[PDB]
Structure 1
Amino acid sequence: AEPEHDERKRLGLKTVIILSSLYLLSIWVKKFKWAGIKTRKFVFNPPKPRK
C-alpha cells in the first residue's frame, strides 16, 4: 500500500530540519527589521490655544 514508505520519511527529515531553521531565522530577521518600531517612543505636549 505504501512502497514509498522509506523515502518519504527521509525526505521529511531533510524538509523539517531545513524548514525549522528557516522558521527560526525568519523570527530574528522579523525582529531585526521591526526593531525600530518596537522601541519607538511617543511624547505629547499640548499646543497653546492662542491659534
Structure 2
Amino acid sequence: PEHDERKRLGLKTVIILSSLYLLSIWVKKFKWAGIKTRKFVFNPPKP
C-alpha cells in the first residue's frame, strides 16, 4: 500500500543524494589539490 508514496520519496531521496555525491567529489578534489600537485626534488646531501 505504500508503493505510490514510496516511489515519490525515492525520487526526492535519489536527487538529493546524487547531488550530494557529485558535490562531495568536487569538494574533495579541492581539499586535496595541494597534495595532488605537490612537487619533490632530491639533491644528494654532501657527506
TM-score bracket for the superposition, by shorter chain length: over 0.9
Q: Could you state the TM-score of these two structures normalised by the residue count of structure 1?
A: 0.90
Q: Which has the larger radius of gyration?
A: 1
- TM (norm. structure 2) is 0.98
Q: How far does residue 35 in structure 1 lie from its aligned partner after superposition? A: 0.3
List runs of 5+ in structure 1 lacking aligned partners.
none
Q: How many residues of Structure 1 are paired with residues of Structure 2 in the alignment?
A: 47
Structure 2 unaligned segments of length 5 or more: list them.
none
Identity of aligned residues (%): 100
- The C-alpha deviation readout for 1:1-51, integer Å capped at 9, x for no partner, is xx00100001000000000000000000000000000000000000001xx
Q: Which runs of 4+ in 1 moved over 4 A?
A: none
Bigger helix share = 2
